[PDB]
């Protein structure tokens, strides 16, 4: 039987190899059967989001949700959560709203629900999602525009108040070059934020990679934790080709970067995968694990 990343990468001293799932995935194809027996940490794919949780003002959904703490918790599985507060998937209501005070009531309304209803049971929570614009400038979603840039403090401040156990993360992608401007922005802004003692406890990288990429998380993954955060991760890793020596040079970012606690990839198999044309997960279409895992395997060996 094949090894367990997850045991080998905690056996190098880190937290968790885990994966982003769902309901209907644990209850189809070997996604249940990989989890249990390869990952230490599950994230809701969707099932979290805002869309998925508050649909309307107050008005929350969390059977999704509920299912996948409560099978996390029954197979002994770290769980991740988030994003609580991201533009891409906001319903339409949050984004008619024009009011500083509304919003602000609104988004910390909807941090307090989600953390309080999984209050102790959650390790990550991923607070502030793709805050930032390519140039490093602060993207201009409903929250930027109405509240402006306090809402990420605000965010984090809430955040904390909700659950003080959670590990409270912003997440990003296209920091996977140390010299993007992208991957210094978020570095500067969360250096300022923590100083002024904003609670961000870790920095996770959206971490979707073309072909030959991995060797630059080498570089970009220290730079993002040089911005003084207790924990930085790598995120929804997905890598076009999933050739082995991309997934490898990510695993040794994360081994060579302390502060690193782990990654998540963006799935299990390669047709379940928001990008299957590229076969870019550990699994393929058979749950046959791929050259990739393997290699991930043997690069984690002691
Ligand atoms: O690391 N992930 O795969 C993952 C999936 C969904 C999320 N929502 N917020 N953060 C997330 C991370």
């Not at 794919?45 to 003002?57: F, I, L, R």
Request: with cysteine.
């Amino acid at each position: 039987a094949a090894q367990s990343i997850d045991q080998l990468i905690k056996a190098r001293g880190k937290v968790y190899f885990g994966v982003a799932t769902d309901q209907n995935r644990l209850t189809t194809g070997k996604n249940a059967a990989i989890i249990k027996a390869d990952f230490g940490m599950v994230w809701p794919e969707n099932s979290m989001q805002w869309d998925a949780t508050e649909p309307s003002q107050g008005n929350f959904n969390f059977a999704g949700a509920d299912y996948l703490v409560n099978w996390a918790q029954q197979n002994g599985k770290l769980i991740g959560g988030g994003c609580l507060v991201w533009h891409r998937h906001l319903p339409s209501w949050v984004s008619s709203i024009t009011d500083k005070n509304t919003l602000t009531n609104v988004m910390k309304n909807h941090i307090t629900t989600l953390m309080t209803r999984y209050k102790g049971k959650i390790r990550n929570w991923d607070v502030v999602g793709e805050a930032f614009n390519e140039d490093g400038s602060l993207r201009q979603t409903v929250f930027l525009n109405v509240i402006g840039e306090d809402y990420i403090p605000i965010a984090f401040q809430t955040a904390r108040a909700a659950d003080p156990n959670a590990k409270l993360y912003i997440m990003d992608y296209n920091l996977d070059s140390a010299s993007y401007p992208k991957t210094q922005a978020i570095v500067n802004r969360v250096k300022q934020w923590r100083a002024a003692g904003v609670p961000i406890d870790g920095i996770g990288s959206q971490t979707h990679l073309s072909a030959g990429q991995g060797a630059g998380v080498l570089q970009a993954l220290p730079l993002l934790a040089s911005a003084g955060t207790p924990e930085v991760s790598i995120l929804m890793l997905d890598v076009a080709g999933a050739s082995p020596t991309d997934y490898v040079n990510v695993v040794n970012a994360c081994l060579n970067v302390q502060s690193c606690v782990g990654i998540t990839v963006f799935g299990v198999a390669d047709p379940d995968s928001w990008r299957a044309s590229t076969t870019p997960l550990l699994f393929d279409g058979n749950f046959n694990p791929k050259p990739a895992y393997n290699a991930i395997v043997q690069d984690l060996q002691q």
